[PDB]
Design a protein around this ligand. Structure first.
Ligand SMILES: [Ca+2]
Ligand SMILES: [Ca+2]
Lengths: 288, 288, 304
């Protein structure tokens, strides 16, 4: 019944504003009221071809919080592993496949072999990572009370930073958002993103420092240009500092103590996002 | 209690028809009518000393489909001395041990130290592999409606291929079967096998191509002679192509599309053959 | 009372006699009547940053025995792991409890600083603390000896690097009038600090050259493996077990005597002992399930 029922979740680009809204709403609903037996008789494959601990643990916890069983591998390194044949087989054992693969396009390729077994992409090479964007959006909505009319600053390697690409694209599905791109000249936000914004009549601008935008942003999204506690003197009371993680020198730990730090809470939201995705995909009926 | 109750399952040869048939009927029961809570209070150890991804995923899923909890390792029992001790310890924890060990003899040894805890061999070296044979037989039974009076063709490396040996051996336990061996001269089916067929009056014959017998075959069991869709033009409506997997080049993808292609379905049957053993070993009587 | 509710379990030093008792009593309870759903609906993280198969399987079985769900890693090499601090900061937002084993000493402690309201249970911290081992050892002694006071306990083997005996000894000393016998290589002797601790408490101890010399007097024979991987190069000679227990040594053993070994064992315990009534190292390992269950239950369940 639900629009996401039995669908593959490969790219954030396949999710419409409505779809995003749907997942986000579900997520909050589940966060409000758990459904420990929602996926009681399901077995889900957690196929981590390339290890990604946080994501895997997040995803598996979500499974368990819905009542599902889990089988899988956390890395291929030590396994006995065509990807195609691998998928055709696993597809005969499980109700859904969550897969993270080292090669971009893998997830998409898997959908051609899973039969009608949904494939949820948990990281495709660098490329696409739908649940990361979802939990990012969820966090913004939650903290911000909305996904429209926000001032959003993205700091770091914007050239290669794909979570930033995906999140920009997703936020751009909403209305009245204003972007600030803070990157070194050599690692700038790609034209293609800029063009897309222009296509939607979305305002964006470039900056050489966070200082420049601090006072105006609601969301400060960091990527590996360094953020220290003192940098927030003039932050907005509602401003939140996000980071898909992990971090490094990029965000000083003295930031962790500030009310702006929200990267761990952000991470904690992957549970609700993942749970929402799983529930909609595997369940016909809605999350009353 | 069923005849397999609390029994070790090391080699299919330990099994008798009353057993295979039991296992087979049970696997069919579960296939139709799942018992999600059959092994609810059991904890099973999944001990893959050497990675066997498909088998382990298959087995754990089986465990879950029955409601058992799972503990274990995917890859690693190098020495008989420490191995015995490992088994000794583990067996104070779980209800059953599912093990795959690369050193032939290892599974039998474990039984010496497991106390009252049943040991199920998931792959002993590159030799004993009871569950593989059971899943093959079940697949044949399931698709052919019987195990007797069948025309079976075995193709590939019939020399160093233990699965074929066992399958042939098992199949020989039934009546009216006729075999076709298609192997390169250097990889021919072993004389001893031939002799046992002889002992029972079972008719067999060697062929240079699949094409020559295609019209007679009920079961086409492939190992590794490239099988292609074109080869099947004259196949019997009921004919199924089987392959224990993995496959490399021996079966062309175009076959995959054909109705005869059953290696994926065969792999899926692994879930039911394995559930059936787990169930028979750990549950007194699963009323059918 | 459950003074253990939501408490971090980092060290045995942190646990009082009442605490120990509470833990052992619960274990006995659980053993008698398991509570297969006591922890249904909890998700526990099994983080073996340092692989430890037997200990890991024990802990996890315990979890399942209570109906909890488990997530985790068997070793850090098969992971993508970023600070431990950030790691715990993240995981603690998903799970109800974190069971951790780590190569560095004080790692578990540090985890407590970042876990928020999530209890951290130490399954091995460098060459430091290993609380549940000590718990299962105590439970084993108490079950077979019917008590934890006024016992004659021998500890044999690598006493220099044997943290489990250092720990077991501290715990035992929390009980009344235990008597210890230390049988170790000249070079892998029990540390001064433990000795000074015993003196302090007026607890008697003595050094021995053999197991035979104490066989007749002991209730518990606690065997250890040489900590090969911790041995200094001026200690390389001490690699081979200096003391081997063989079945023939049991001839004058007290009837109630039990041979324990935290495992795994190298040469120190010959196989012929395994079939004697004195061999109790496998039973001991089995009791790891009850003790681990007990600790989880207390930490995660308000009421006993
Ligand atoms: Ca709006
Ligand atoms: Ca705290």
């Amino acid at each position: 019944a639900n629009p996401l029922y039995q669908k593959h979740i490969i790219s954030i680009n396949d999710l419409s504003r409505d779809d995003l809204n749907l997942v986000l709403a579900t997520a909050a609903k589940l966060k409000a009221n758990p459904q420990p037996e929602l996926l009681k008789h399901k077995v889900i494959a957690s196929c981590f071809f390339e290890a990604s601990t946080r994501t895997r643990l997040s995803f598996e916890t979500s499974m368990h919080r819905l009542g599902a069983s889990v089988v899988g591998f956390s890395d291929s390194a030590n396994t006995s592993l065509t990807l195609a044949d691998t998928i055709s087989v696993i597809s005969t054992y499980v109700d859904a496949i969550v897969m993270r693969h080292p090669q971009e396009g893998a997830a998409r390729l898997a959908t051609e072999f899973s039969g009608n077994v949904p494939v949820l992409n948990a990281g495709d090479g660098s490329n696409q990572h739908p649940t990361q964007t979802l939990l990012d959006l969820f966090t913004i909505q939650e903290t911000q009370g909305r996904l429209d009319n926000l001032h959003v600053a993205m700091v770091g390697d914007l050239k290669y930073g794909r979570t930033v690409h995906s999140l920009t694209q997703a936020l751009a599905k909403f209305d009245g958002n204003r972007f600030y791109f803070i990157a070194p000249d050599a690692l700038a936000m790609p034209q293609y993103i800029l063009d897309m914004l222009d296509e939607k009549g979305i305002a964006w601008s470039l900056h050489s420092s966070i200082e420049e935008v601090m006072a105006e942003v609601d969301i400060l999204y960091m990527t590996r240009f360094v953020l220290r506690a003192s940098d927030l003197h003039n932050a907005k009371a509602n401003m939140k500092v996000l980071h898909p993680l992990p971090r490094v020198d990029e965000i000083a730990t003295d930031v962790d103590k500030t009310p702006h730090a929200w990267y761990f809470q952000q991470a904690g939201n992957g549970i609700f996002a993942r749970q929402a995705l799983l529930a909609l995909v595997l369940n016909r009926d809605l999350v009353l």
